[PDB]
Design an enzyme around this catalytic site. Structure first.
Site, PDB file in Angstrom:
ATOM      1  N   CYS A 148       0.811  -1.181   0.000  1.00 26.19           N
ATOM      2  CA  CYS A 148       0.000   0.000   0.000  1.00 26.19           C
ATOM      3  C   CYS A 148       0.854   1.243   0.000  1.00 26.19           C
ATOM      4  O   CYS A 148       1.488   1.562   0.992  1.00 26.19           O
ATOM      5  CB  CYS A 148      -0.835  -0.172   1.233  1.00 26.19           C
ATOM      6  SG  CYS A 148      -1.871   1.254   1.459  1.00 26.19           S
ATOM      7  N   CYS A 184      -0.428   4.065   2.397  1.00 25.36           N
ATOM      8  CA  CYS A 184      -0.115   3.648   3.767  1.00 25.36           C
ATOM      9  C   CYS A 184       1.324   4.064   4.040  1.00 25.36           C
ATOM     10  O   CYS A 184       1.587   4.542   5.169  1.00 25.36           O
ATOM     11  CB  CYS A 184      -0.259   2.109   3.958  1.00 25.36           C
ATOM     12  SG  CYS A 184      -1.821   1.214   3.482  1.00 25.36           S
TER      13      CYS A 184
END
Lengths: 105, 105
Positions: B32, B35
């Site tokens: 991600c 993230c």
């Protein structure tokens, strides 16, 4: 039927061998319960539509392909026609899955 | 600062040791990119707010805790007060992260 993708090479070449067919890719993961709930309907669709190619990428094995396609939610379905991404949505919604397939075929 | 969770036992006990404090948990993953983009702001928030507890769960290590909390998108922030989940949202939105913290503190 559903082709299991285990590398960036196989992802790239399958989109190359698809020719003009629609390719639907299922970005799934082991911890995703909705992704488990929709795997049989995903496999039924590959048998119903012989003229569409159905791929599965588990994001945990193919973290590169997962970062490249910018996967956010589980599951994501991305749709490709001649290597161009023509659609994408997130969520285990069976009607919309088949609805979008019938739109891009 | 940000506590790394590596088991269901540690998740359960940290929510038990938090007492009455707000606990913010970041459900993240390696693939991600958003993230990754928000990890420094997440760590800055733990230093700014000493009276809130900040946890990180990587869904790939804790697939059990990830299925239990029904994580869908990356990243997800779930908010707990006395073991009750009081909030949750998905996406790497820094203003909303801090906005919800100031709402549930």
């Amino acid at each position: 039927m559903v082709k299991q993708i285990e590398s960036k090479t196989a992802f790239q070449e399958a989109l190359d061998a698809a020719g003009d067919k629609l390719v639907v890719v299922d970005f799934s993961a082991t911890w995703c319960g909705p992704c488990k709930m929709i795997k049989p309907f995903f496999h039924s669709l590959s048998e119903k539509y012989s003229n569409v190619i159905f791929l599965e990428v588990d994001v945990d094995d193919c973290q590169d392909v997962a970062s490249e396609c910018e996967v956010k939610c589980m599951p994501t379905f991305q749709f490709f026609k001649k290597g161009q991404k023509v659609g994408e949505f997130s969520g285990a919604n069976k009607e919309k899955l088949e609805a979008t397939i019938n739109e891009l075929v």
